[PDB]
Amino acid sequence: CFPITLKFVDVCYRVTILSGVTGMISPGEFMAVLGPSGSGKSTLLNAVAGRLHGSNLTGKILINDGKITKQTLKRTGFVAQDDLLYPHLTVRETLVFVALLRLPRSLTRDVKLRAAESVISELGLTKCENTVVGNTFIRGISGGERKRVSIAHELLINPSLLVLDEPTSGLDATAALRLVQTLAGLAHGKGKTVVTSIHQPSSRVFQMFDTVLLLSEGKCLFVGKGRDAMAYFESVGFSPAFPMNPADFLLDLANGVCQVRQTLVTAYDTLLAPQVKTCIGITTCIATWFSQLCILLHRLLKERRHESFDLLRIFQVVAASILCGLMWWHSDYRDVHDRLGLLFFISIFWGVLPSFNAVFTFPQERAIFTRERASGMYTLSSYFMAHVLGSLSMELVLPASFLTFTYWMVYLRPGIVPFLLTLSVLLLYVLASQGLGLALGAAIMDAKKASTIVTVTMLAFVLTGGYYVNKVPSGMVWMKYVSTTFYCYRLLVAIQYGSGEEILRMLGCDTSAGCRFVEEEVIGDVGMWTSVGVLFLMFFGYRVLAYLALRRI
Amino acid sequence: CFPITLKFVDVCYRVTILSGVTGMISPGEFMAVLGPSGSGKSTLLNAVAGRLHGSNLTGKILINDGKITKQTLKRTGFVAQDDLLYPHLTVRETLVFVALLRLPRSLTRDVKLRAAESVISELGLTKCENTVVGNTFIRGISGGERKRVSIAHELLINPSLLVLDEPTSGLDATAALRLVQTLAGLAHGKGKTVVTSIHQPSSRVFQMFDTVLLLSEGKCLFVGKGRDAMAYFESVGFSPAFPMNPADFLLDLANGVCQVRQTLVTAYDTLLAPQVKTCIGITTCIATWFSQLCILLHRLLKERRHESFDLLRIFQVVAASILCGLMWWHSDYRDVHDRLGLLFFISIFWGVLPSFNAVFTFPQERAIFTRERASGMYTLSSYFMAHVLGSLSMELVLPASFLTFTYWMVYLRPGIVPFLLTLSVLLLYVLASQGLGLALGAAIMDAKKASTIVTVTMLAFVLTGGYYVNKVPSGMVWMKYVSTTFYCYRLLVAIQYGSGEEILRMLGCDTSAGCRFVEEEVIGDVGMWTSVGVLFLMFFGYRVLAYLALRRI
Ligand SMILES: CC(C)CCC[C@@H](C)[C@H]1CC[C@H]2[C@@H]3CC=C4C[C@@H](OC(=O)CCC(=O)O)CC[C@]4(C)[C@H]3CC[C@]12C
Ligand SMILES: CC(C)CCC[C@@H](C)[C@H]1CC[C@H]2[C@@H]3CC=C4C[C@@H](OC(=O)CCC(=O)O)CC[C@]4(C)[C@H]3CC[C@]12C
């Protein structure tokens, strides 16, 4: 193994939440960053892992007596408090995909699979490797297993310095003890440098750590051996008045509640601090981008299959198709108004549903994307393109089945050519609306606010679709040309009626009002090819804007 | 005070989570119910407070050496783990409303207010009495303060038996310690019989219970004084091998892991269990219903104001109004098709918004309602009617402003009489659609499923509203007669055009298709009075069905 002797001196995160903190941890030591809420333990462990930087951070952080560099980040892993795992991917599949993404591409796929399986077996996940990870919504692995998977995500890289952040927070006592035992075995058996910040450790848990460092409102008050806390603190003059837990005594004293803070921090600076101070390729790029794309597509296929194929959504589409095939059951080709209403309702449904359902995919996965992009698992372009391709594959199945039922139940324009034409138009419109939803959900990451914004914009698109109101004011017809629903409706009308020659012959005109009812509603101001071109342009441009918005964050 | 002594013997909850649990708690005893997860602490606490009953519970529970009666429940409280508080009510207002609903009506309102203020001061909430309670969404009081408010809710009845199911779960160490201090003061200063199922207490927290009782897989492992656990267990033969927290050691022994369960259970049954066993007016109804209605209306006014006037909902309504006033800006009266499209769009918007928003009011409060219905705070009829009245008052402001802007930015039928006619029709339609949403959200209690069902049924209503398709199949025309949107659309058409005499004179009509396009659209198959009566009938019947569904649960 490549050992890491991590050190930190005078690290003060002056915003203060950190000041006057020093010490070190040697390889094979199981660290304990204890302290109460707001004492800077999480801040200290984020800073020591390279997450925090800039003028807000002072002091020195040394890795093997050297400044933290890129190779350091390649050799140290950080387990954040928030477990950002894909709910519908099993533990084995999740960590296999992570190993494929973050391990160097020089390693063969079989070698990455073997490493992933070894990591599964080492962390005790082999009993639930085939169990779906799940989340609070869909049942899956337990909290301890979820945190173990989160650690394993940072263990496939094989780091000697593993900096966890509250791994037993919100965990069962037995499960927390088992996880702390696993961390201690990693520090001892694997010879790793494990640094963890346990919120409120238990008794056996406190017995597990080989080295304890606790702060006090941003000031490190005691750094030393795990079992040397009691002796040092009774030497200072602070002793339990009852059978107090060493961890509980340590935390309660951190607040200054004993029998305080200033006298004992001075004592630490005069007795223990001196002791701890004296103790111290273009084709290759294309290939890797495409492999990242493939791995991300395979890992998000389950997410799309449970998101785009939601049973509630499936029932929604089925009910819409049944209502379409019953309301327009064997609809006459000559009934211009009813057929146009059907086409406009199809446009409304398949513009509202895809955009609305897409507007959440980016806000709900933003945390996972940021966590896995800051670690270098994949680039933004590859992740965004894989998301776009998977959603393209999965958001057309429901409209395709809907149209397959409706077109033949309604008795629309017969033949196979107009069925493929209207199916292509409907799928392109669904893709364009979905891209608009993606752009709106990426521009701002508030899921509810983005939902309201896409609702407002598609309400505007529908009201300008050319059906509800035909005599648009001269100062408002401009918006009609930027509405996806308008172009879809015009394409559907052109497929069903063409230039309206046959329907105009049926009407007779080529009454003034009757002619107008079939003149502007059937023969629009946009050609059949111009509408297709603008639909494709919007399909590309909305996703381009979504990618730019992702680049903004 | 009225001292109360719980005396439970052989309390086993088959179909096991409890078996052979024996013990008692006297006034002034701050008993703790310790044990690992699933050992039966919560189940025993619920059963000992009267929550659990039936053949599933076997054994004997005595209150003041007598069987639990209805009068006892008026003297025993129960602080459940789930804090069911209205987020937008301040602590003072929340607990004043709770005191009004809970304390007997013979007490004057000023006396109830004084009792509520005294309870605020006693539990340390006087520093945050004016602070909005909030929840995970809207910021407010802390978790410890939230649990304190729950305890106060269970304390306004003034019970001498407080039964706190996991009150420090999710609480900070200092917050949990302070809450346990408050509970100990309640047990000692107020002479109350306080029993709690502490999950994982700290050292001070463990020191603060006068007596403790442990669960081990449903068996009473040790009952006695809080400070006698260590001595009794070293007498048995179990001693800490390290400095171990008495609570932590107690829980670890309860898990059976110790350097076990069966032999020590036998030892308890041999030594300590024998010791415990040896120690073992219709006008008044109307007045109270109306006072409950008024109090619930005042308590839910803030919820409706921050729910029916959501900034996202307000933005949606404003955007819809602006799009109505722009798309149909200075709309001509003679333009029958565009006017009918505007009316149908109004019907769609104001049948979808309230129906969708109503399917969440009942589920998101259901638990709270149950928590405040089994305890006898109010009856189902009063709560449901207060909810209906508040939603009636608060769900008409947005449609009223929307129509006020649209009617005069679109140039519909001028004058004041048709404006109030269309406003009354729109508000009645909003009420009917909201009642449909309430009925569908009460029939099934899942918010997402209710939303999907209500949107499917409103999709059916809109597709049969008489605008999208006019030549309805003979086997499908029955649905339009049960569609709220259809009746609203017909009423709007009758307001804007009446019998269509003026527009027919404008057209000169009496081609045939052009004449029918207006005759079948403007002149429907339902009269104005018939549509109004059916709208009112549906408004009443949907809420009746919602009340019946609430009665089902
Ligand atoms: C015939 C044309 C006009 C149809 C176009 C749809 C519109 C009528 C708009 C106006 C009211 C809109 C609704 C207003 C408010 C909401 C709440 C909103 O709730 C959320 O933010 C849910 C977030 C989540 O699910 O996580 C979901 C969209 C929805 C139903 C909107 C969906 C689109 C609606 C139905
Ligand atoms: C053309 C006319 C009839 C307008 C109605 C068509 C669409 C605008 C509707 C039909 C189905 C609706 C969906 C039905 C169910 C829901 C679940 C809902 O999720 C919730 O439960 C959110 C709860 C919350 O808002 O807090 C989010 C909106 C959504 C997808 C709805 C969005 C609006 C949709 C697409």
Curated annotation (Swiss-Prot), chains A, B:
Catalytic activity: abscisate(in) + ATP + H2O = abscisate(out) + ADP + phosphate + H(+)
Location within or outside the cell: Cell membrane
Gene disruption phenotype: Hypersensitivity to abscisic acid (ABA).
Regulation: ADP and vanadate (ABC transporters inhibitor) inhibit the ATP-dependent abscisic acid (ABA) uptake.
Single Gene Ontology BP annotation: transmembrane transport
InterPro entries attached to this UniProt entry: AAA+_ATPase, ABC2_TM, ABC_transporter-like_ATP-bd, ABCG_dom, ABCG_transporters, P-loop_NTPase
Main localization category: membrane
Keyword Magnesium part of the UniProt annotation: no
Extent of the signal sequence: none
Gene3D superfamilies: P-loop containing nucleotide triphosphate hydrolases
Ranges that cross the membrane: 281-297, 309-329, 340-360, 392-412, 425-445, 450-470, 522-542
Up-regulation conditions: By abscisic acid (ABA). In cauline leaves, activated by cold stress, but repressed by heat stress. Within inflorescence meristems, down-regulated by both cold and heat stress treatments. In developing siliques, activated by cold stress, but unaffected by heat stress.
Positions annotated to bind ATP: 35-42
Tissues and organs where the protein is expressed, per its UniProt entry: Mainly expressed in vascular tissues,predominantly in phloem companion cells, with highest levels in roots and seeds, and lower levels in seedlings, stems, leaves and flowers. Mostly observed in inflorescence meristems relative to cauline leaves and developing siliques. In seeds, mainly expressed in the endosperm and, to a lesser extent, in the embryo.
Keywords noted in UniProt: Abscisic acid signaling pathway, ATP-binding, Cell membrane, Glycoprotein, Membrane, Nucleotide-binding, Stress response, Transmembrane, Transmembrane helix, Transport
Membrane topology per record: Multi-pass membrane protein
Glycan attachment residues as annotated in the record: 56
Chain ranges of the ABC transmembrane type-2 domain: 291-497
Positions of the ABC transporter domain: 16-242
Family statement drawn from the similarity comment of this UniProt entry: Belongs to the ABC transporter superfamily. ABCG family. Eye pigment precursor importer (TC 3.A.1.204) subfamily.
Alphabetical list of PANTHER family matching this protein: ABC TRANSPORTER G FAMILY MEMBER 25, ABC TRANSPORTER G FAMILY MEMBER 28
Role played: High affinity abscisic acid (ABA) transporter that mediates the export of ABA, with a preference for (+)-ABA, through the plasma membrane, especially in vascular tissues (e.g. phloem companion cells), and is involved in the intercellular ABA signaling pathway. Together with ABCG31, export ABA from the endosperm to deliver it to the embryo via ABCG30 and ABCG40-mediated import to suppress radicle extension and subsequent embryonic growth.
Name of the protein: ABC transporter G family member 25
